[PDB]
Structures are given as C-alpha cells and as structure tokens.
Symmetry: D2
Subunit: 280 residues, 4 copies
Amino acid sequence: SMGEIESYCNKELGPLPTKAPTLSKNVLDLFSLKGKVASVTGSSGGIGWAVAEAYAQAGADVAIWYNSHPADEKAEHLQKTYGVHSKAYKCNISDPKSVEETISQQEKDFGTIDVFVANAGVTWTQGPEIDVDNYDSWNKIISVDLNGVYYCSHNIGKIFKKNGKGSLIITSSISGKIVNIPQLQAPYNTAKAACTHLAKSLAIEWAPFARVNTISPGYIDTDITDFASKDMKAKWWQLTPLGREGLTQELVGGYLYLASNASTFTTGSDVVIDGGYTCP
Amino acid sequence: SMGEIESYCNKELGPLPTKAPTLSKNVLDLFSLKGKVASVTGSSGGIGWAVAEAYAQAGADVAIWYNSHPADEKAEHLQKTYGVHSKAYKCNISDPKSVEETISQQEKDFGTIDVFVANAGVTWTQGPEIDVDNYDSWNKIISVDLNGVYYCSHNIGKIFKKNGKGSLIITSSISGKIVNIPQLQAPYNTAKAACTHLAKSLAIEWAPFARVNTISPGYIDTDITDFASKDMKAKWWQLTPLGREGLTQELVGGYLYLASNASTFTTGSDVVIDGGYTCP
Amino acid sequence: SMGEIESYCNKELGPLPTKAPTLSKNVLDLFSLKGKVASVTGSSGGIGWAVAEAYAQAGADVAIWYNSHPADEKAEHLQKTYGVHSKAYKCNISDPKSVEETISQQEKDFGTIDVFVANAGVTWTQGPEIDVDNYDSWNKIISVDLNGVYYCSHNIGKIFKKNGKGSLIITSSISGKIVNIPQLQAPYNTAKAACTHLAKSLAIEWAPFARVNTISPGYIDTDITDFASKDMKAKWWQLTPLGREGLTQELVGGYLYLASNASTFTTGSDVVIDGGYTCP
Amino acid sequence: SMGEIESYCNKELGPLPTKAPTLSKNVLDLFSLKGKVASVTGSSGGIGWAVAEAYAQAGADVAIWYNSHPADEKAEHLQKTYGVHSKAYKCNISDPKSVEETISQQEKDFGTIDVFVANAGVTWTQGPEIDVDNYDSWNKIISVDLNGVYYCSHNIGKIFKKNGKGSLIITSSISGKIVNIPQLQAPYNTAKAACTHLAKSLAIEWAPFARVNTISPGYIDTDITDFASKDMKAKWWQLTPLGREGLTQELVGGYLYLASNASTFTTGSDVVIDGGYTCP
Ligand SMILES: NC(=O)C1=CN([C@@H]2O[C@H](COP(=O)(O)OP(=O)(O)OC[C@H]3O[C@@H](n4cnc5c(N)ncnc54)[C@H](OP(=O)(O)O)[C@@H]3O)[C@@H](O)[C@H]2O)C=CC1
Ligand SMILES: NC(=O)C1=CN([C@@H]2O[C@H](COP(=O)(O)OP(=O)(O)OC[C@H]3O[C@@H](n4cnc5c(N)ncnc54)[C@H](OP(=O)(O)O)[C@@H]3O)[C@@H](O)[C@H]2O)C=CC1
Ligand SMILES: NC(=O)C1=CN([C@@H]2O[C@H](COP(=O)(O)OP(=O)(O)OC[C@H]3O[C@@H](n4cnc5c(N)ncnc54)[C@H](OP(=O)(O)O)[C@@H]3O)[C@@H](O)[C@H]2O)C=CC1
Ligand SMILES: NC(=O)C1=CN([C@@H]2O[C@H](COP(=O)(O)OP(=O)(O)OC[C@H]3O[C@@H](n4cnc5c(N)ncnc54)[C@H](OP(=O)(O)O)[C@@H]3O)[C@@H](O)[C@H]2O)C=CC1
C-alpha cells in the first residue's frame, strides 16, 4: 500500500481506477443475452414468467423456478420456441439448504450463471398488524420475502466471484419506498424496504465481480393482488399518475436493461416502474 | 359512510378532518414530559442511557431495559437525582414472549406507557457476507435489530390504542439510508432500512391513537464502534461534513422533540442526526 | 499536508477530527436561545410569526421581516411581552441589494445574528403550466422562492463565517419531495426541491462555521392555501395519515430544535412535519 | 362526473382506469425507434452526441443542437452512417424565444417530435459560493441548467399534447441527490435537484399524453470535468463502488430504455447510472 490508490469502498477492487469494460459501439447489441445463462426465481408466477421469456428472446439459457405450481411445460415452451436450453427446478425458497442445492445444480446443468433474478415473493393479506397476534404471519413474510432473497443472494455471489462477472436483480416493490393504502401491510413493506437496501449494500461488497440492482414495480396485473376488492383497486388507480395498473410486459424492458451489457455502470440502483405512483 | 369524508389511509380515523390537540402557549413547555412514563430499550448502553436520563430531566418516569449488563443502579440514579420513578428490567429482545411480559409488567408497575423508544441493537462485525457461511450471524442481526423492534412495537401499539395516545420512536441508523464504508455490514444495513420503513408503515396504521418516528444517528462516540481501528475512524471523519463523531448529548434533543408535545403533527418522519454524513 | 487527516468534504475544517462543542448536561438547557439573535424572513406571515414568537419565548432577540404587510406592531409585541429586543424590517426578498442592506443593518442593530430562518415565500396558483405561456409566473416563483432564499443565504453565511458560529434554517415544503395533487404546481415544487438541496450543499460548504437544515411542512392552516376549494382540502385530508391540516404552533418545536444547541450534530437534514403525508 | 372514477392526480386522464398500449411480443423490438423523431439538446457535447448516435442506431431521425461548437458534420455523419434524417440547430438555451423557435422549426422540418432529451448544461467551477459575489455565476447556472430545461419542456409538452404521445428525458445528475466533494458547487447541485423534481411534477401534469423521466449520471469521462486535477479524480474513484468513471456508451442503454416502448409504464422515475456513487 504505497503507490496505489486504494478504494474507500472495497479494497478488493485493487489499485484504482478499475478498467472499463469493452462494449459494442452499437446500442442494440448491448441488450443481447446470447451466450449467457439466466436464473429467475418465481418464474411459475406472473412477473417471473414474463421476465424468463424475455430473457430467452434475448438469447439466454434460462433456469426456471417453481414451488407449488410445476413449470416444466414453461421451460419446454422456451426450448421449442426460441431454441435456448431451459429447465425447471422445484424449491421452497424459505429453506436455505434447498436454495443452495438448487443453485449448485443449476451451475452444473448450465455450466455457469450470468444473470440472477431473486423474484419469488408472497403478499401480506391480513390487514393491520395490531390485530394479528400469531407471529406466524410476520415470520412467513420475513422468511419468504427477505430471508429467501438473502439465501439466493449469498449463494449466487459465490459463483459470480469465482467467474469474475454477474448481474443480480432483486424484485422489490414501491412498497419498499412508500406505505400502501388503503390495504395495510406493514410486514410486507418492511421486507421490501430491506430488499432494496440489501441490494445497495451488496453492490458495494460485490463490486469487484458483479452488479446488484432492484426493479421496484408498482401495481401490476397478476394474481398476487387478487385479494383486492374493486373499490380498493379504484383507489389505486386514482392515486397513480398514469391512471391504471401496469402489465407484466411493461416490466421486461427494465429487467433486460439491468441483466445485459446495457447497464455496465449501473449498480446499487432502484429502477422504479410504477406509472408514477411514488411521485405524488 | 354517507355525508362523511372517509380517509384513504385508515378509515379508523373516523370522519375527516380529525382535530388538533390543545398545546401550551410557551414553546419550552411543549418539551415537558411531566406526568408521562417513558420506556427505553437498550438503556444499559450508550445512546439508551443518555435518552433515559434526558427523559428524566424532562420530568418523565422511566423504565430501563438491559440484557447482559444489569442496570438497577442506573434506575436508582434517576430516582435520587431527578425525583422520578424508575425501575430496570432484564429482557432478551429476541424472545417475543419475554418482550410481551416485560411491557405488560411495566404497564402495571407504572400505570401506563406514554413514550416508547425501541433502541436496543447489536452490530455486524464479520466483514463481507460472502465469507460468512451458515446463517447464524444473519439470523442474529435480523432477530435483535428487526424482529425485536417489531415485538416491542406490536405490544406497545395495544397500550397506545387502549389509551388513545402515544409516541413510539425507533432508533434506526444512517445505515438504513446509506451503505457504510469501509467496514462492510450488509445485514445490519438491511435491518436498519427495514426499521425505518416499519416505522413509516406503523405511522399510518396507528394514526388514530399514536405517532411513530425514527431517529437515525450517524457515528456517535459509544462502545458499539469499539471494533474500529484508528484508521477506520479517520476515514469516517474525512467523509463527515462536520469532521468528527457525535456525542450522545447531541442526540437527546431529537429524542425529546419526538417524545413530547413539541411534535404533535410529526409522524412517519426520519430525524437524521449525522453531522451531514448522508449528504455527500 | 503531512501529519494531518484532511477532510474529503472541506479542507477548511482543518486537521481532523474537529472538536465537539461543550454543551449543558441538561437537555432542557439545550433549547435556550438566551443571549442569541434570530432573524426570521416572512414573519409578517403565518409560519414566520409563530416561529418569531417562539424564539422570543426561548430568549432570543428577534429581527422581523415584512414586505406588503408592516409588522412593527409585531416586533413591539415581542418587546412588551417577553422583554427581548425586536425590530421589523421592510424588504422585497427578490431584490438582492435590498437583502444585503437589510442583513447588514440587522448586524449593526443587534450586534450579530446567530440564527437565520429563510422562510418568506409565495405559492403558484395558476394550475397546469402547459396553459401558462407568459413566463412572468415562472420567474416570480423562482425569484421569490429560490433566488430570494439564496440571497439571504449568501449574505448570512459571511456573518456566520466571521463569527465562527451560526444556524441557518430554510423553510422548504413537502412539495420539495412529492408532487402535490390535485392542485398542479410544478414551478413551486421545483423551487422547493431546489431549496432542500441548496441547504444540504451549503451544509458541506459552511461546516467549519455553521449548520444548515430545512423544515419541510405539510399542509398548515395559513392564508397561503386560501386558493383551495373545500373539495380540494378534503382530498388533502384523505391522503394525510393523521387526517387533518397542521397548525403553525405544531411547527415551532422543530424550528427551535434546529435553531438551538439541541441540534449541534444536525446539519444537512430535512425535518419533515407533515402528519405523515410523504409516507403513503 | 357521476358513474365515473375520477383521478385524484389529473382529471384530464378521463374516467379511470386508462388503457395500456399494444406492445411487440419480442422484448428487443420494444427498444426500436424506427418511425420516430428524437430531439437531443447539447448534442455537440459528450453525452448528447452519444445519445444522438444511439438513437440513430435504433432507427430514429435525430435533431442535433449546439451553441458554440457547430455540429452540421455530426448530423451529416448520422445520415451517411445510419440512413436516418438529421439536421443540426444553433440555439442559446437561456433564450426562451430562441428555444421556442428552434423546437417549432424542428417540428416543421421533421413533421413531429416523439422523443425529447433536455441535456445541455454547464458546470460550476468557482468553488465555494461564499467567495463568489454579485450573482452572475449563480444566474448563469440557473439560467442554463434550470430555466433552459423548463423552456424546452414547456414547448415540447404542447407538441406531445397535440399528438397525444411523447417521451421527455431530462439529464439531471447525481448532484441532484448528493453533494459533490471535494469540488464545492452548491449552485449546480441546486439546479440539478430542481431538474429532477420538475420532471416528477411534469409526469403528473402530462400523464394523459406523455411520459417524463430523468437520467442521473455519475462521473462520466467527458470534457465537462476537465477542470479536475489528477488528485480530485482519484478521490472520486475512491468513493465510487465500481472504482472508476463511466463511459458515455454506458449511458445510452438507459436513454434508449426511457425513449422507447420498453418503458410504457415508467414515468416520474430517476434512472441513476453512477457506478454506485450515491449508495455509500
Ligand atoms: N404484481 C405486483 O403488483 C407486484 C409484485 N411485486 C413482487 O413481484 C414478485 C412476483 O410476484 P407476482 O409475479 O406479482 O405474483 P405471483 O403470485 O404471480 O408469483 C409469485 C411467485 O413466487 C413463487 N413463490 C411463492 N412462495 C414461494 C416459496 N416459498 N418458495 C419459492 N417460490 C415461491 C410462486 O411460486 P409457485 O406459484 O410455483 O408456488 C410464484 O412463482 C414478488 O416478489 C412480489 O412481491 C412487487 C411489486 C408489485
Ligand atoms: N454510532 C452509534 O453508536 C450508533 C448506534 N446506532 C443504534 O443505536 C442503538 C444503541 O446502540 P449503542 O448505544 O450505540 O450501542 P451499545 O452497545 O452501547 O448499547 C447496546 C444496547 O443494546 C442492548 N442489547 C443488545 N442485545 C440485546 C438483546 N438481545 N436483548 C436486549 N437488549 C439488547 C444492550 O443491553 P446489555 O449491554 O445490557 O446487553 C445495550 O443496552 C442501537 O440500535 C444501534 O444500532 C445507530 C447509529 C449509530
Ligand atoms: N402553510 C403551508 O401549508 C406551507 C407553507 N410553506 C412555506 O412556508 C413559508 C411561509 O408561508 P406561510 O406562512 O404559510 O404563508 P404566508 O402567506 O402567511 O406568509 C408569507 C410570507 O412571505 C412574505 N413574502 C412574500 N413575498 C415576499 C417578498 N417578495 N419579499 C419578502 N417577503 C415576502 C410575506 O410578507 P408580506 O405578507 O409582508 O408581504 C409573508 O410574511 C413559505 O416559504 C411557504 O412556501 C411550506 C409548506 C407548507
Ligand atoms: N460527468 C458528466 O459528464 C456528467 C454530466 N452531466 C450532465 O450531462 C449533460 C451533458 O454534459 P457533458 O456532455 O458531460 O458536457 P459537455 O460540455 O461535453 O456538453 C455540454 C453541452 O451543452 C451545450 N451547451 C452549453 N451551454 C449551452 C447553452 N447556453 N445553450 C445551449 N447549449 C449549451 C454545449 O453546446 P456547445 O459545446 O455547442 O456550446 C454542449 O453541447 C449536462 O447537463 C451535464 O450537467 C451530469 C452528470 C455527470
């Protein structure tokens, strides 16, 4: 440590400045995932399936994840339609040994993992916490929506570090930045705020070998909000600047942006896709 | 619900607008805690003891909490020095039954609780997470620094709702807004970001009967940072606009502001006390 | 520059660490303004008058400012009621020469200025900008609500630097963080966001000799919102977690917190007093 | 307004919910600008030229803007290399009549404008403001970096409203979120914070007919930072989690994301591209 500029963030970067990547000079080539492997949790569900198919369209091999709804059909659909390799894996994301085994098997099956999306999650549907005295509900939210994200993150970081490259995207929510109304869901908001700032924290720790970012969707038309009444959804619309819920196909551009070489200087960022909801 | 303005936030507010409290005409009297009971977790430690003593100086009865460092002498010091009632209580904040029993016993011993400070916490000192396997350290941080805060909140909210009044303050950190460097501590930062947004979420849910806010300190000269080498602290000072660490006496004004009638329109807020650290 | 820790923020701090202030060990003494001089712009108006009187109650001499409504009566009320020195000054805050002359005269009249509140401001009342083609309205908002704040700031910083001490508070708004609805007021929101981050920027530049912070009120019952219809105010109430507008007397605790020795480690912070409005 | 869900944000949306657009089934086609016209201010300079060329690569006709550095050869380069229409225009962005005339002439020359990037800007290089008297430098920053951005926005909004579609991107900066060190530049930071919140405010006002977003770059290797000594840049690198400055090619993916149908539910958002700078 003489004659070196040492990072205040992370000395594993080595002597500063680090070298910039060599990129295509054409912007469209930056979004290609040809030659890359993506792994997407919760891809039996609405957002995860849309992201999985978009990544296959961009050229990636795709590992699909499910728990209570088998998705082998879905992996086979990607193989037949786009000619990529795709396989589906069953895993309860709450079980850290299962997450480790699943990610290790995917590395064997596909050779490596270049892009990881920690997307699986569940809602809180029980109203104000003051009336919920059984902590099982709190524990469930924290276990699936925070611990499960961390188990995925801890395991994939080791692969990214071994290979010297990677992009991790965590699906957070506008709930990590604001307090949803009129449905009261403090435990879910808490878990999502934790996810957003876990991502920023890992962006510093992993900077020598990977990027880490969040996508924070607003209200998207999937089954996850099927608990909402029609008067509840109407109030969401009234408070959304664009005046509606979004579709899953309006998220896939952002997931591909973060996954690909279009975003090689983007890390620790929270890409909000919410029709303006967090602005008013 | 005809001819009433209903809240989009919490319809338990009743017909809108709600009504403001009467307040002392002298600004200094707004800060008084005469006639009030405060309960401060982690008040065998640095910040918690300073807050407990400040609250006694402002006239409050004070319940003190400890775990590994018995604090009966601190409670006796408050009685002898300020003439308030004080008693110290042992509780592992990770144990939800013990938290419930301790808060119930304090309500019975003191009659009520008007002000609650969820302040107890532990640091992460293991360095970058990628090398910290099995999940015992992660679980310890989440258990004490998030679950313990939620156990306290769930229980005190019931007392505030029964009484129709209360102020809850959660000690978060600048680590809830930024990523500390060079000491890498993703799990701690994650827990504190969760704390900050749990407070905002509870501010909506408890609005008919209580206010909820956080204090986010920067680097304060206590023991929680004694893992810090001379060169690590020097870097903190270089990045702090005021050029130094803070004293616990520089926090107590903000804890008194939030606890008292000085802040009756303040809820869901994060009062940052950090020498400017989060600005660069 | 050998054998000194030099700040990365501001080398005028001198060798690090800077020295902590010597404070009272009693929390209530920290809020005293005895022996100090405060100057409050817009103190013919609602918020500024409440703050001026609170500072006099805390022991400060107070310089009052007006433009279209003379406030000599108000200064005399402070002298007769609290026994402090108080004088009122006429100044169009849009005129930089007038601001400089006013602040220079106050320094002569009172000896020094210890606390400055840049509070004067006007609303935008003309609806969506797309239909306002005369830039006079934009220029007015920027001139009074941003340039005027900067003219005050630039002048008072020179006094604070000469004396080595000072606290500057800028009245911003929740409009600096969110987008008000349903009244569309982009130019005012823009000016207030500028004020909030001007304060953070000056906190770094002035750190050797002064603190700089904002108060960001939510909806407060003053004349400034008298353009609002009753259906407009009802929607504000529906979106405010506490369910109502605030009173000016619910702000004065925060202004005294920031003005006094209760906040000597607080700089570059934005103290939000909004009934929770910015949370949902 | 009976039997219609009215917006609380902008009742010009009409009865809610609004309806989503049809989108290409292939994610890569979402990023195409074939058939579209883009207008990019400051595209004689570093970032602006990179964005203009990227938009031509994606198929757009491009209007180029310059002030002191004539750029007809850049426009001819886009025509010869990509087969798009391109023309360069001279305009002092501080002059509102000239901005209006330039945007009107581009609408006539190209037929319409679909994508507008308000990117032109100048730095503050005077150091701490306290020593910079008279207000000419402050006025220059506000005039170019805020007023000029507003003049562009006011005019293009009229075209977007007439056509019922459009995407406006404002180039802000990390300086809109944090306070740069060690180079002290409060007026620039103030202008960029204003830009970021002007964009959010316009996102609500323009929601029936356009999206509005910002790109906030960190330190990018262009000429705008040539005032920077070797030791100043070294400190920037030490505080940047990725350990380096970014390339303009690392920004164009984000500008294409926001300009195109990849982001039809994205409005009021701030896409930060900073190597992690705003996270510590
Ligand atoms: N839709 C929206 O409005 C928003 C959603 N989000 C987030 O988006 C992500 C996807 O949610 P979305 O697609 O909307 O809802 P879905 O319910 O459609 O998808 C949920 C997914 O999570 C998986 N999952 C649930 N629990 C577990 C578990 N214990 N172990 C493993 N996988 C599990 C499900 O797998 P299976 O069905 O096979 O059990 C399914 O694939 C979630 O993190 C959600 O919080 C964030 C913001 C807004
Ligand atoms: N720079 C700083 O000092 C900063 C601190 N903070 C936060 O401030 C709060 C106080 O920390 P500080 O006073 O600095 O550190 P201390 O270590 O001095 O105080 C720690 C306190 O937490 C209590 N505690 C620890 N574990 C448990 C447990 N399992 N159950 C119950 N109580 C427990 C300790 O009790 P005992 O000693 O009796 O076991 C002690 O009272 C913490 O939340 C910390 O994260 C935030 C920002 C900055
Ligand atoms: N009330 C609210 O809901 C909120 C208000 N604010 C901010 O609070 C501050 C005070 O506003 P408030 O008290 O509510 O409204 P008032 O209209 O009651 O007070 C306005 C004050 O500004 C002064 N002023 C206006 N223009 C000028 C000028 N050109 N030169 C000098 N002084 C001038 C007026 O002086 P005179 O009357 O003598 O001309 C008056 O003292 C403003 O910055 C406002 O933006 C922020 C958030 C919420
Ligand atoms: N690190 C960086 O480079 C960062 C830059 N930014 C922002 O990016 C944008 C581009 O800056 P960059 O490309 O880096 O710097 P350049 O100096 O390379 O580009 C400056 C551009 O602004 C134009 N311009 C300057 N003054 C005027 C004016 N009065 N009227 C019209 N056009 C004008 C110049 O035109 P001409 O040369 O023809 O006069 C040139 O096209 C700016 O808004 C800057 O604040 C934000 C974050 C980081």
